[PDB]
Amino acid sequence: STGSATTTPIDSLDDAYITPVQIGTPAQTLNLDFDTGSSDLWVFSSETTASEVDGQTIYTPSKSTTAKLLSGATWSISYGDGSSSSGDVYTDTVSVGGLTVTGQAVESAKKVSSSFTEDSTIDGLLGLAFSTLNTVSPTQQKTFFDNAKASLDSPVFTADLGYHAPGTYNFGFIDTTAYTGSITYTAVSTKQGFWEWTSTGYAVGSGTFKSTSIDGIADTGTTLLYLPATVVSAYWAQVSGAKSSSSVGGYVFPCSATLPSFTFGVGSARIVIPGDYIDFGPISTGSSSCFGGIQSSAGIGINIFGDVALKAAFVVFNGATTPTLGFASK
């Protein structure tokens, strides 16, 4: 089997992407944030504290003839941005772009933090990291990909995120028309439960490539590119007027600037992030100070290849017995 679904930016900055997901019988379609940095599929629901729902589409398990309470199971998660959610668990039928999993754990939110409430466009998350990170207790549950894997034509999914435009998540096949040149594959460590890999270096604009190992995670659920302070300083030093602002919470730059590209290494290959991808617009409405899309990972404890990086590539998440990651230009 295979699946193919379009993923759409939630706003004009590409702050996140949503992908329609069919849950239950008859189908209830929710727009979920596919997140290769976590491993819970959770949804706004009829069980969510009413004051914490503001415009989201909810899953109502009592209206699904295939929903079954997973007795005793609870979940609770906190994300790297400080947001959180928790609740109980159902199993139900879940389909993504034509690919169907029966018995998928669907984590129903009873509580969500303000960040989720305030984002009307995201109805929940669909985790695509390794199932070892799944928070369901006392019986850990598998991700959608893990459940689908054996049935897939090939045990892979691909992320093809658009810049200011829709893109695609494919399951079970590699669309050879979706990228240019060849795909370069690189080793993955699953020890922390992430799609963790080592970039071979970077360049700033037309500058020379610096060969240096950068350990990081491929994370579709993180907006920006978080890299070591040395790397990030080298980038923003090429932008007149750019500075790190403690009050704003990162590097800002004059909105009048033209940003240089940023290149990262995948083995001997190179992925180029155009400068425009690194512009996240005014820090506040009407400001001439703009927020940068490359930020320091210092104090996160891990480097994160988020959407800013991944949207410059066609990315293969290879879930074979020994997982790997592939990157192609597009």
CA atoms of 121 and 15, how far apart (whole Å): 11
Closest CA to 27 of 86, 83, 97, 82: 97
CA atoms of 210 and 141, how far apart (whole Å): 41
CA atoms of 128 and 8, how far apart (whole Å): 17
Q: Which of 14, 33, 35, 307 is catalytic?
A: 35
Domain boundaries defined on the chain: 5-174, 175-330
**Residues forming a β-bridge with 201:** 211
CA atoms of 330 and 269, how far apart (whole Å): 13
- The stretches of 3-122 forming alpha helices (DSSP H) are 114-117
Q: What is the CA radius of gyration of the chain?
A: 20
Q: For residues 70 and 105, is the Cβ–Cβ distance under 8 A?
A: yes
- Residue 63 CB neighbour total at 10 angstroms: 12
182 a catalytic residue = no
Q: Which two tokens stand for residue 85?
A: 């959610």
CA atoms of 165 and 249, how far apart (whole Å): 27
User: Which residue type is seen at 167?
Assistant: G
CA atoms of 257 and 282, how far apart (whole Å): 12
CATH architecture label of 175-330: Beta Barrel (2.40)
Secondary-structure breakdown of the chain: helix, strand, coil percentages, each rounded to the nearest 5? 10, 45, 45
The beta-carbon contacts of 137-145 under 8 Å, at least 24 apart in sequence, are 137/73, 137/74, 137/75, 138/72, 138/73, 139/70, 139/73, 141/70, 141/73, 141/89, 141/105, 141/107, 142/105, 143/39, 143/41, 144/41, 144/94, 144/96, 144/101, 144/104, 145/171, 145/317, 145/319
Closest CA to 77 of 114, 105, 42, 47: 42
CA atoms of 257 and 139, how far apart (whole Å): 52
DSSP 33-64: EEETT---EEE-BTTS-GGG-SS---B-GGG-
For the purposes of burial, counting CB atoms within 10 Å of the CB of 44, is it exposed (0-12), middle (13-18) or buried (19 or more)? Answer: buried
Q: Which of 199, 261, 296, 297 is catalytic?
A: 199
CA atoms within 13 A on the CB side of 138: 2
- Residue 210 CB neighbour total at 10 angstroms: 16
With a CB cutoff of 8 Å and minimum separation 6, the contacts of 25 are 64, 65, 66, 92, 93
State in Å, rounded, how far the first CA of the chain is from the last one.
25
Q: For residues 213 and 200, is the Cβ–Cβ distance under 8 A?
A: yes
For the purposes of burial, counting CB atoms within 10 Å of the CB of 240, is it exposed (0-12), middle (13-18) or buried (19 or more)? Answer: exposed
Q: Is the dihedral of CA 134, 300, 84, 120 positive or negative?
A: negative
CA distances 256 to 102, 242, 243, 253, 282, Å, are: 52, 11, 14, 8, 11
Q: For residues 77 and 84, is the Cβ–Cβ distance under 8 A?
A: yes
CATH architecture label of 5-174: Beta Barrel (2.40)
User: Which residue type is seen at 235?
Assistant: Y
Question: What backbone torsions phi and psi does residue 115 show, to the nearest 5 degrees?
Answer: -55, -40
54 a catalytic residue = no
Residue with tokens 């129903």: 108
Q: Which two tokens stand for residue 86?
A: 């928790």
Identical topology for domains 5-174 and 175-330: yes
Solved using? X-ray
Q: For residues 33 and 126, is the Cβ–Cβ distance under 8 A?
A: yes
Backbone φ/ψ region at 193: left (φ over 0), alpha (ψ -120 to 50), beta: left
Pairing of strands 210-218, 225-227: unpaired
